[PDB]
Symmetry: D2
Subunit: 359 residues, 4 copies
């Protein structure tokens, strides 16, 4: 569907920051800085610029006050200045709306391209950025739940193979995926920096942003987040987890900000930088693929995701998935999942694992 | 009401071991030894004797081959040889059936008393025991999921207040409980050794044994047990967890052995040895009381538990609870739970937390 | 030989708090509160009262402004009010000075007895204390190096067997000790609460206070204290560690406060509550006894310790040890230590392990 | 002084494996397999092939029986089969001895080029390697001390700047170095894979191999290695640590194999893949540069290192450093180090930190 341009792909380094529209800047500030302990690079009455403990670029998260909570841009750092020109020609050849600012769209970023990409997502490409104090040895500042890096984004899109091919052309390498025996793809993970992923597609009504993911050093740092959320009596904002993922093998947690933007806390996946890095495909009915301990996937995880904006700041039209639903085929009334393939013991039919059905 | 005897209670030091009857010895061995890493002190075609990493007494668990899987004895060590006589007098005055074996009921234990207690539970009291090599610095043997001590038992009984009074008289001090505003007690925790408990009472049809708990050093050790069960493709034997308890504050996991005896893995509760240790009462509707992160309590946790035997080796008849059911008042069709008292937001009506209903 | 009184010992529960005299109260506040994260129960111009994360009694540590930095009192909590009576009668029979104050010596303590004990140490015994908010679930307050309990004191005294027998009559049970093949005892560890110790004797010139130890939950919380002191550029106040102890098997770290009072951080020793708990004796020349990894023991650890005060607030006269010196016999010019008993390989003559002499 | 070739550099992915010659195969196997838990990919009477938990290529270490313990090859994987031709051309232009084997030098490596590089080190470049089962989710085989990846090499060489420029032409990017005000360089670290390093240069008599480094997931894994070595009564084989590095910010430990080959265990350094990644220069006298906590650097760490072999299997002649010795300027009789720059308090003159002097 999406052809490969003749123009060369920009050389993408890694996911770098997201810009999220939030409704109430103070309430968001409490969440990101007071609960989560992210580091303020800059803030005013309109925006809060936040970085992780080990980051030296200006920010990993920008929160912008607005009327409608949404993703405004997912940004990728490119290797050279010229790569911003290479990105522009690329998305031009594709027929996508693009916007170039030599001065950047946000503080702490220089020359940048924003695009409405083929999947309806607002991507940013940029090289130039304001270096700040790298806080990686500032143990006087370290919190028990310290967020040390931006790791990845996850995008909800109807047709996964279509998006996958397009990301592949752009230079992302696919590391794992979820399929069924009848040829349906439910999800795919792909990378540039040599971790399991820098972004990922999740099958579903799209464009929507599923989540943004930050890394911690150790599993006990993720346990601390949960513990702190209990003490602040906000455990209702813990959406799902903690657990160990099947796909990626990372220890994980999903939480929800004031505007229901989903944040993932993530640690200890594996190295993927070799070009013949072996791929891993999971069957959708495998009850260890998402939570390795067989714990049930929370139904909100499959249905809820953030709005995304176009370049005029307007919410993008959602298109409905027509391929089968992961929720439905695993935990819905006609779904099933298994612990050992072909074994009736430890399998679930028409309900989730651990004795639950959908609420 | 169980009367306080005139006879002095045995000075109980701690929970010491449990004797569990199992149907297939070889399968059971694979779980406790090969999966969980417990250390064999003795075995034959009929029994397996197992101790934790820091134990010096002969064993913490005895698996005994039998035709019906059940708790045969929950054993407590007492401070002196003389306390065994005390225990016999005490139980006789209560009108209970007792049996005394000067050379013990199981290997590695000397003079012992077993009783059918007023709650219908098979308790043992002993002092004499064969000292073995204490493995506390045998780091050459240390597993990534190493089980380091026996921590507690947990008992299902229909009338908690009644059992509580009897256990206080016996010298246990209640450290935490769960109650509602209408007079109902759903569970109680009680100790001798200065941790949160040596046993506890869980409201339900009983006598049934709810679980036996072992401790790890660190939270990562419990994570590894989950990870290993995932690798062995027996995640369906993970019943509930891992999580942070409210009551007790401990990190925890619950897993099911081949006869569905429930085992808890536990770490990092607090010191309770001062005689005026503050008692903590939780409301039964508080959705952070069992799992602090608010994850739903799996239904089987409330409905399933092991049979217990009398002194003749027959299963004790089960007496139904008539008091309110914790399951029903919190996660049942007319149930209710809350995150913040008096707040509707993050409350649950007629269902479980995180988007689930009972399957 | 200190005689055994006819009067019964008081029932001691555990070590409870220390009172340290400090010379600059602001400078000390910065260390114990800002660096270490101790929680303030009460403060004014003259005194700071601090508790650990899991404590429900008023405080574990009192910092008292004064002219000469010293130990003012090491306090042990007793099981009942009448144990303070037993304590007074006990020490009086011993011929020791006593002072009783019905309203206590520091805020938050009630009826209290302080004594100049047979070894020159200021011991306190009390029962009454003001209960405070137990912060054990206050994870919104939890530091990456959080101190969770008061664990023990360690005293320096010239004649270890003499002190040992006195502490034994007083109800403490020896757990581990250090001796040589010539009859000399160098150190002894003894307890009431069922951990390795509540106090301990280190041979040397005394009465002096070697240290006060606080516990953490996990090994990484001790690592963080080190990492924080690095980031505050006060690494010169890390005296020794971190490491794994041979004796006690605890993970450990020694640091120095503004007045050189030594503080230990400690986690994960083993259960000692059974009366036949197997005692362990190490040879003084075993290079794994103090640090299990063989790392050398810093000479200041052997030579430096705090002054103690008598009941009139004057520094106790120091009596010189004549028994052999641990320092000299192990790491001095004619000292010796071994890795494997009998083996010349991995032994050290006239120097420290790992390639070092003493400066 | 090493000129840049006109021939394009091979595209280097990462350090891949080391081949070490050992004198007693059986004893070396005990150390690497039974003590350290590395995984066998192939073994016979002459050689052991070992890999780390997360590796998919054939091996990360080859132990080769032979007369003199030494490094035989340090191998880097390249991007494409063609990069092997490029490396041959590159080194031929340098005037270095080369040897090309189309079916490789060791099992499970295909087309390979070995060389005697300008510093005298036997480098290998390959692309082709036999894929093996990636053990990253094999938690049934995970050890409490698990080694999860090969992270880096560290080479000892007399002229750090000379070596630095040659590695830079070869595509390695410098991340951190150690220098003094007089203009001497003592040490430099350089990468390809996006971590602090794939190889490093330590100033000293060379060519020697300083160490081979493996990563763990968490800091506790490294503490387990030290605990297990105390239990095996081989703590004398613990050379240095465990510690937090200043350079790299990684938690670390140095141990010694039966042939005195040094192994580093290492975790949690930071991301370096952006092309403008800030370089960090430390002053040689800063006592927090090597151990962040101020612990002394063991002198053997500076003086001892492994012989390396030329292409005929003969040991390479060692050239003496004429630049200043890091040992002598920091811990030698004329050296010094500081905690805070310019502050004499926490400074050390003519000795090491923590009250120690050179052995
Ligand atoms: O004595 C302590 O300090 C302690 O906590 C336990 C043991 C100890 C030294 O102090 N040790 O070196 O083994
Ligand atoms: O981070 C992730 C990796 C694995 C995964 N999953 O559920 O296994 C989902 C996930 O959230 O996708 O981005
Ligand atoms: O270990 C326990 C402590 C707390 C608890 N719970 O679910 O809170 C249950 C529990 O399992 O009872 O013994
Ligand atoms: O790997 C490292 C990192 C830093 C370092 N150092 O002494 O700081 C030495 C090495 O062996
Ligand atoms: Ca009610
Ligand atoms: Fe994710
Ligand atoms: Fe329990
Ligand atoms: Fe101590
Ligand atoms: Fe290194």
């Amino acid at each position: 569907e999406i052809p490969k341009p003749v123009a060369p792909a920009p050389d993408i380094l890694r996911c770098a920051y997201a810009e999220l529209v939030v409704t109430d800047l103070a309430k968001s500030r409490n969440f990101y800085v007071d609960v989560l302990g992210l580091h303020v690079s800059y803030e005013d009455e309109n925006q809060i610029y936040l970085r992780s403990f080990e980051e030296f670029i200006h920010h990993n998260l920008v929160l912008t006050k607005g009327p409608v909570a949404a993703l405004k841009a997912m940004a990728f750092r490119v290797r050279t200045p010229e790569d911003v020109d290479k990105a522009e020609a690329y998305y031009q050849e594709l027929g996508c709306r693009t916007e170039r600012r030599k001065d950047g769209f946000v503080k702490g970023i220089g020359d940048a391209l924003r695009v409405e990409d083929p999947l309806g997502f607002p991507y940013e490409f940029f090289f130039e950025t304001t270096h700040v104090e790298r806080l990686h040895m500032r143990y006087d500042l370290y919190s028990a739940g310290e967020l040390v890096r931006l790791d990845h984004f996850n995008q909800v899109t109807p047709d996964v193979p279509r998006g996958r091919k397009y990301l592949e052309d752009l230079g992302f390498r696919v590391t794992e995926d979820i399929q069924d025996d009848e040829g349906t793809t439910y999800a795919a993970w792909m990378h540039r920096k040599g971790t399991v992923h820098d972004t990922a597609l999740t099958g579903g009504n799209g464009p929507r942003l599923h989540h943004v993911a930050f890394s911690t050093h150790e599993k006990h740092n993720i346990i601390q987040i949960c513990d702190k959320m209990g003490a602040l009596r906000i455990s209702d904002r813990i959406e799902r987890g903690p657990g160990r993922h099947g796909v990626s093998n990372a220890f994980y947690l999903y939480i929800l900000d004031p505007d229901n933007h989903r944040i993932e806390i993530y640690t200890q996946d594996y190295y993927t930088g070799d070009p013949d890095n072996p791929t891993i495909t999971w069957n959708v009915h495998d009850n260890q693929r998402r939570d390795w301990w067989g714990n049930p996937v929370v139904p909100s995880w499959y249905t809820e995701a953030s709005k995304v904006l176009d370049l005029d700041g307007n919410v993008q039209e959602i298109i409905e998935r027509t391929d089968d639903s992961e929720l439905e085929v695993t935990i819905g009334a006609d779904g099933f999942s298994f612990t050992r393939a072909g074994d009736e013991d430890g399998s679930y039919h028409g309900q989730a694992s651990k004795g639950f059905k959908l609420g």
